[PDB]
Amino acid sequence: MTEYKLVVVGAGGVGKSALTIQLIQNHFVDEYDPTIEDSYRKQVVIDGETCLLDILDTAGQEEYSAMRDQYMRTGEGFLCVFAINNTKSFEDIHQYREQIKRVKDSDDVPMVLVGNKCDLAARTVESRQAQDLARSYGIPYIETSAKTRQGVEDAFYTLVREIRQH
Ligand SMILES: Nc1nc2c(ncn2[C@@H]2O[C@H](COP(=O)(O)OP(=O)(O)OP(=O)(O)O)[C@@H](O)[C@H]2O)c(=O)[nH]1
Numbered sequence: 001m002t003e004y005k006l007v008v009v010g011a012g013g014v015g016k017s018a019l020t021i022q023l024i025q026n027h028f029v030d031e032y033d034p035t036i037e038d039s040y041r042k043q044v045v046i047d048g049e050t051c052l053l054d055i056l057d058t059a060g061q062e063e064y065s066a067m068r069d070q071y072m073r074t075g076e077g078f079l080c081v082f083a084i085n086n087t088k089s090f091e092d093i094h095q096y097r098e099q100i101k102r103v104k105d106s107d108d109v110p111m112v113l114v115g116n117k118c119d120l121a122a123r124t125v126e127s128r129q130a131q132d133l134a135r136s137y138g139i140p141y142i143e144t145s146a147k148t149r150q151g152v153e154d155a156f157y158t159l160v161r162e163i164r165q166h
């Protein structure tokens with residue numbers, strides 16, 4: 001079947017694993033459990049197409065740079081995640097986007113900007129500023145909560161659709 005190589009990136013603790021585990025395992029992980037590199041393979045049906053989601057859940061730790069170019073080259077689509085209560089994670093998005101573009105030789109790679117932890121009250125990043133950033137990249141902006149599952153399928157399925165349209 002058609003396989004989609006999806007890669008979730010972003011700063012440490014923004015919820016990359018929590019989003020992925022919600023998608024694949026239907027629950028919220030509330031624990032501290034930093035990732036090195038996890039792979040998830042799941043057969044799904046999206047818009048009537050049988051497909052395999054091949055998802056790589058990456059490390060936010062900056063001490064894992066080298067591993068990054070490797071996975072950025074083979075991924076077809078990227079979720080670039082920040083947390084809406086962590087401005088530094090938002091500011092970091094530019095560095096992940098630039099790194100992906102450079103290793104993929106492309107300024108138009110399938111990507112979604114994901115503002116996670118939208119269940120939380122203490123927001124520090126306004127949705128308008130992330131939407132503006134996303135428009136500047138020409139990609140969709142989707143807000144999510146791994147906690148409540150708000151937006152989770154929407155983000156991953158939107159990314160699959162971006163890959164389909166590439
Ligand atoms: N309130 C809430 N907390 C969340 C949400 N997403 C993740 N978290 C919490 O934030 C913490 C870090 O979430 P992870 O999913 O481990 O973060 P990560 O981006 O995978 O981190 P690294 O693997 O270290 O890069 C955890 O305590 C999760 O429970 C979310 O949408 N809402």
Ligand SMILES: [Mg+2]
Nearest residue numbers: 016017034035
């Ligand atoms: Mg993780």
